[PDB]
């Protein structure tokens, strides 16, 4: 039972943290067009191994800071 998210690294500046963006398509409730929506998550990156632009697999965990409730599971693709 390993619920997980996949997204790409938009910021790697913070010490041991990263900002990840999860993008998805969604049907528009009224006009039916499929629209891009993005969800940015502050995620934990102990060891700072995640570079900007990387594609990373993340999971939900307990609060790590005022805004971090997610941590890194592993890198998928890097340095496009």
């Amino acid at each position: 039972k390993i619920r997980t998210l996949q997204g790409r690294v938009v910021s790697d500046k913070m010490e041991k943290s990263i900002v990840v963006a999860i993008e998805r398509f969604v049907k528009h409730p009224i006009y039916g067009k499929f629209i891009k929506r993005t969800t940015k998550l502050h995620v934990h990156d102990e060891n700072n191994e995640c570079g900007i632009g990387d594609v990373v697999e993340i999971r939900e965990c307990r609060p790590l800071s005022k805004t971090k409730s997610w941590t890194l599971v592993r890198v998928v693709e890097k340095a496009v």
């Binding site: 528009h28 009224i30 006009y31 039916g32 067009k33 629209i35």
Partner: protein
């Protein structure tokens, strides 16, 4: 037209503007008679129509019709007004409720009495 366009700017229904704002979504309002007078109507009609200016309990001051044949109303008369324009009298958007508060019923009415505040005649 475009879906894209509506997705940026949704259909937006126009909000209906009222014809009796002084009532503020109340069925009647109370008010004091400021002026009680007559006025002439618009093409093609011709008469001396009874109207009054009325300061309402909510501050609004409006002109109101005094329907029926004959009325005993003057300044400081406290009356009840209801919605209802007078078409050949521009500006006039309310009617006075005959037979409420200081406004008497129409004298000697037999038909449509309840629209003129007239009790049922003993008979």
């Amino acid at each position: 037209a475009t879906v894209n366009q509506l997705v940026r700017k949704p259909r937006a229904r126009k909000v209906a503007k009222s014809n009796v704002p002084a009532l503020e979504a109340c069925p009647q309002k109370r008010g004091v008679c400021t002026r009680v007078y007559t006025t002439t109507p618009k093409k093609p009609n011709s008469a001396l129509r009874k109207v009054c200016r009325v300061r309402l309990t909510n501050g609004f001051e409006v002109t109101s019709y005094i329907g029926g044949e004959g009325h005993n109303l003057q300044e400081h008369s406290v009356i009840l007004i209801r919605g209802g324009r007078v078409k050949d009298l521009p500006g006039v958007r309310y009617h006075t409720v005959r037979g409420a508060l200081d406004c008497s019923g129409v004298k000697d009415r037999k038909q449509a009495r309840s629209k003129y505040g007239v009790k049922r005649p003993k008979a």
